[PDB]
Amino acid sequence: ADLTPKVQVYSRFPASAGTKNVLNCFAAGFHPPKISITLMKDGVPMEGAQYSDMSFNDDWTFQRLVHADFTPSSGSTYACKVEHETLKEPQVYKWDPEF
Amino acid sequence: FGSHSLRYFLTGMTDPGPGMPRFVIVGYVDDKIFGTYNSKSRTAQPIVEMLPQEDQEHWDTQTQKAQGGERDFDWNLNRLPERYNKGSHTMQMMFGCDILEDGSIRGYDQYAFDGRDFLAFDMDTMTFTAADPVAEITKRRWETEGTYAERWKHELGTVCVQNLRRYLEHGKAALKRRVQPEVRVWGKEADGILTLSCHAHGFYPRPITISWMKDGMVRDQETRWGGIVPNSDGTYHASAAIDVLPEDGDKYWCRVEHASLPQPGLFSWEPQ
Numbered sequence: 001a002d003l004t005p006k007v008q009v010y011s012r013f014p015a016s017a018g019t020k021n022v023l024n025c026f027a028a029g030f031h032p033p034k035i036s037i038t039l040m041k042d043g044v045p046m047e048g049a050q051y052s053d054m055s056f057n058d059d060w061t062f063q064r065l066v067h068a069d070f071t072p073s074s075g076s077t078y079a080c081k082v083e084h085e086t087l088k089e090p091q092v093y094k095w096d097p098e099f
Numbered sequence: 100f101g102s103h104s105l106r107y108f109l110t111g112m113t114d115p116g117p118g119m120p121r122f123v124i125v126g127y128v129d130d131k132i133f134g135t136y137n138s139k140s141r142t143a144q145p146i147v148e149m150l151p152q153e154d155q156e157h158w159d160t161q162t163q164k165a166q167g168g169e170r171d172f173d174w175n176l177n178r179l180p181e182r183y184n185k186g187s188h189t190m191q192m193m194f195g196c197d198i199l200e201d202g203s204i205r206g207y208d209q210y211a212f213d214g215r216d217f218l219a220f221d222m223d224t225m226t227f228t229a230a231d232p233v234a235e236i237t238k239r240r241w242e243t244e245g246t247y248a249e250r251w252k253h254e255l256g257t258v259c260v261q262n263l264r265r266y267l268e269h270g271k272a273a274l275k276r277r278v279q280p281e282v283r284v285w286g287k288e289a290d291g292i293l294t295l296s297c298h299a300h301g302f303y304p305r306p307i308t309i310s311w312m313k314d315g316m317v318r319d320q321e322t323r324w325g326g327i328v329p330n331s332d333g334t335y336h337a338s339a340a341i342d343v344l345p346e347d348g349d350k351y352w353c354r355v356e357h358a359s360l361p362q363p364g365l366f367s368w369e370p371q
Contacts, residue, residue, distance in 0.1 A: 003214075008325060010336050014283040014300055024336070026328045031214040032187050034116040050331065053135050054115065055108045055125045060191060060211045062110075067331045098285040098298060 003061070004086040005030040009079065009095040012067070016099060017074045023095065025080030028063035036083035037066045040092070042076050072097060101200035103129055105263035106193060106207070111172030114187035122169045128266045129274060130305035131333055134158075136165035148333060149273040150266065157265075168192075179212050182233050188213055196259035198267075206255030220248070222255045277359035278303040278334055284353050286368045293345045295368055297353035298325075301334040308356040309339040313347070317354075 005027040012022035023046070027037050033054050039046040052065040072078070078095040104127070111122045120137035127133065133150055136143040143161035145153045175190040194208040206222030216230035218237055225248040229238040241247040267274065280302035287294050297309055311322050318341060325338035343351055353366040 008328060010298065010300075010325075010328070010338070012301065012330050012332075012336075014281050014298070022331065024328075024330060028328075031189075032114065033110065033112050033189060034114050034119075034187065036116070052329075052331070053125050053137060054110050054112070054119070054123045056110065056191060056193075058193070060214045060216075062214075065329055065331060096285075096287075096296065098283055098296065 002086070003029070003031040005035060005082050005084050005091070007080060007082055007091070007093045009093050011072070011095070011098075015072045015097050018071060020069065020071050022067050023070045023072075023078060025066045025082075025093070026063070027066075027080075027082055028057065029061045030063075030084055030086065031061055032085065033062040034085065035062070035064060036081075036090075037064060038081045039066060039068050039070075040079045040081050041070070046070060074099070102197050103263060103267055104195060104197045105259055105266065106195040109168055109172065109190075109192040109194075111169070111176055111190040112187070113176050113189070122172055124165055124168065128263065128270060130303075130335075131270070131274065133266050133270060134161065136162065136169075138169055141166065146333075149270045151272075153269065175212070179217075179233075182236065183212070185213065194255065194259075196255050196263055198260060198263055204256065204260050206252075206259065208251055208255060220251050222252055225249075225252055273333070276303070279359040280307065280337075280355060280357055280364075282353070282355055282364060282366050284366045284368050286348055286370060288345055291345070292342050293348050294340055294342050295348070295351055295353075296338060296340045297355070297366060298336070298338045299355055299357070300336055301330060301332075302337075302357050302359065303334045304358055305335050306358065307335070307337050308354075309337055310354040311339060311341040312352045312354055313343075313350050318351075 006029040007027045009025050039049050046068045049066055049068040056062045080093045081090050083090045106127045108125045115121050120139040122138040124136040132146050134145045143165045172190045176188050180188050191211040197205040208220040210217040217234045219228045227238040227242055229235040280299035282299050285296050310317050321341050323340045327335055327337045348368050355364040
């Protein structure tokens with residue numbers, strides 16, 4: 001209820017090194033709706049990201065999905081970086097690769 | 100008990116962000132986006148993976164209705180901040196209907212300003228309810244007109260239900276198709292604690308359950324649930340984690356219940 005974004009990062013399919021996949025970042029629970037959500041590989045923005053049309057939950061708080069096609073590499077670090085006016089600094093969320 | 104729902108989620112924004120539309124509508128049938136509108140394209144269009152054979156006539160109508168809503172919201176964002184003696188602003192509406200197996204219907208119509216409840220309409224009694232004394236001005240003006248209540252009764256109890264029935268028929272294949280979760284269990288040890296994570300990838304419909312168990316007994320006190328979150332293709336993701344002793348890793352089981360599975364699935368951590 002603080003109106004900061006709550007964020008999680010997950011792959012579309014169970015991940016395997018070198019197998020094409022999609023990386024998702026879902027931010028929810030925030031207000032106002034303006035938000036920067038950026039998928040990052042080793043500190044570099046991922047190309048080809050797509051964002052969902054602005055929508056909201058039954059409690060009126062806003063949410064957005066960002067996703068990008070990617071081929072996960074062991075020894076790369078993937079993250080979702082979020083900027084929002086409730087946040088003093090950008091917040092980052094690491095993807096747990098599950099391999 | 101069977102039922103279906105049609106919901107429209109309308110957002111107008113004074114500050115949507117660079118290159119983002121100021122007004123957006125997302126429409127859902129059950130747990131599925133069926134269509135959208137935004138103020139950049141100025142077009143209402145179906146999600147073809149749900150509604151693959153739509154006629155343009157219907158969507159011309161939806162487009163014009165949505166353009167009207169866009170105009171209505173533009174005026175709200177101008178007028179309401181002043182009334183509240185109040186930076187950026189938003190207007191939201193959630194409306195729609197349900198049809199139930201028992202033959203009945205329900206209607207919903209709720210508004211919010213700056214992310215706070217503003218106004219609601221009750222189809223059955225044809226009355227409005229305001230969230231605060233400023234909103235009460237709108238409530239009283241609308242009700243004294245007589246027309247808003249008649250028009251919304253029609254919109255929810257006739258138009259919405261006709262469209263819901265239409266999308267259920269047109270979208271039958273996508274709505275009834277079940278997609279199984281691909282479940283993975285992973286383990287990671289850090290500082291003497293093994294965290295077990297169960298992720299269910301790409302399931303449809305939305306309802307799912309995930310439980311962690313040891314020696315047959317659920318460990319709900321120790322479980323952290325990630326929540327059910329969307330994929331871009333209309334399917335969903337969910338997760339649960341639990342922290343365990345490394346030596347106990349092999350005796351925990353993740354149970355997943357989903358409509359696509361004939362029985363609850365059971366999954367364990369199997370490190371090499």
